[PDB]
Design an enzyme around this catalytic site. Structure first.
Site, short mmCIF file in Angstrom:
data_model
loop_
_atom_site.label_atom_id
_atom_site.label_comp_id
_atom_site.label_asym_id
_atom_site.label_seq_id
_atom_site.Cartn_x
_atom_site.Cartn_y
_atom_site.Cartn_z
N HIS A 49 0.82 -1.19 0.00
CA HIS A 49 0.00 0.00 0.00
C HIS A 49 0.86 1.24 0.00
O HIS A 49 2.04 1.21 0.29
CB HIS A 49 -0.94 0.00 1.22
CG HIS A 49 -0.35 0.59 2.46
ND1 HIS A 49 0.95 0.35 2.87
CD2 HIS A 49 -0.89 1.39 3.41
CE1 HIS A 49 1.18 0.98 4.01
NE2 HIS A 49 0.08 1.62 4.36
N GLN A 121 -6.35 -2.13 10.43
CA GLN A 121 -7.52 -1.31 10.71
C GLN A 121 -8.64 -1.83 9.80
O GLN A 121 -8.48 -1.92 8.58
CB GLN A 121 -7.22 0.17 10.41
CG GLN A 121 -6.06 0.78 11.23
CD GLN A 121 -5.96 2.30 11.11
OE1 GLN A 121 -6.90 3.03 11.42
NE2 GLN A 121 -4.81 2.79 10.65
N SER A 144 -4.97 6.46 9.87
CA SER A 144 -3.61 6.76 9.46
C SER A 144 -3.59 7.74 8.28
O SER A 144 -2.56 8.36 8.00
CB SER A 144 -2.88 5.49 9.06
OG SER A 144 -2.80 4.59 10.14
#
Length: 153
Positions: A49, A121, A144
């Site tokens: 990511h 998350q 985040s």
């Protein structure tokens, strides 16, 4: 019909017929699939990511700048732009993740290794497990900041 998350839409004030994914936030003209039922989901998935953080991120800091000032909207402009660049082929995901990602994973082409549900998350996780090997997501929000998830395994 259509794997988890997928749907058929039509862009605002613009006659466009495509597919959208409620979980991954992915958009594409092509249909995701074409009979594989009871397929459920894998137990583990390796992912990469690229993260852009803003002022409301739980930790408004990153290896790229001691203090993050960019706003939510500005950070979203960047994600979109990176997405536009990835998709156009002008720039691959890895190098973009290594050059601008706000996660220490930037030094690993943005890889995070294989993980299972529980650690990440929920927003990022649901996306990851909703993605298929080789698929990339649209903007994904977590405490985040905004992510761009790419499932590798």
């Amino acid at each position: 019909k259509l794997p988890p998350g997928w749907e058929k839409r039509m862009s605002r004030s613009s006659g466009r017929v495509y597919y959208f994914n409620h979980i991954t936030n992915a958009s594409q003209w092509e249909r995701p699939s074409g009979g594989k039922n009871g397929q459920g989901e894998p137990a583990r998935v390796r992912c990469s990511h690229l993260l852009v953080a803003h002022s409301q991120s739980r930790r408004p800091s990153s290896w790229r700048q001691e203090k993050i000032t960019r706003t939510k909207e500005e950070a979203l402009e960047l994600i979109n732009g990176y997405i536009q660049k990835i998709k156009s082929g002008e720039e691959d995901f890895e190098s973009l993740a290594s050059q601008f990602s706000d996660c220490s994973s930037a030094k690993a082409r943005g890889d995070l290794g294989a993980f299972s549900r529980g650690q990440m998350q929920k927003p990022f996780e649901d996306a990851s497990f909703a993605l298929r090997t080789g698929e990339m997501s649209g903007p994904v929000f977590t405490d985040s900041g905004i992510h761009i998830i790419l499932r590798t395994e």
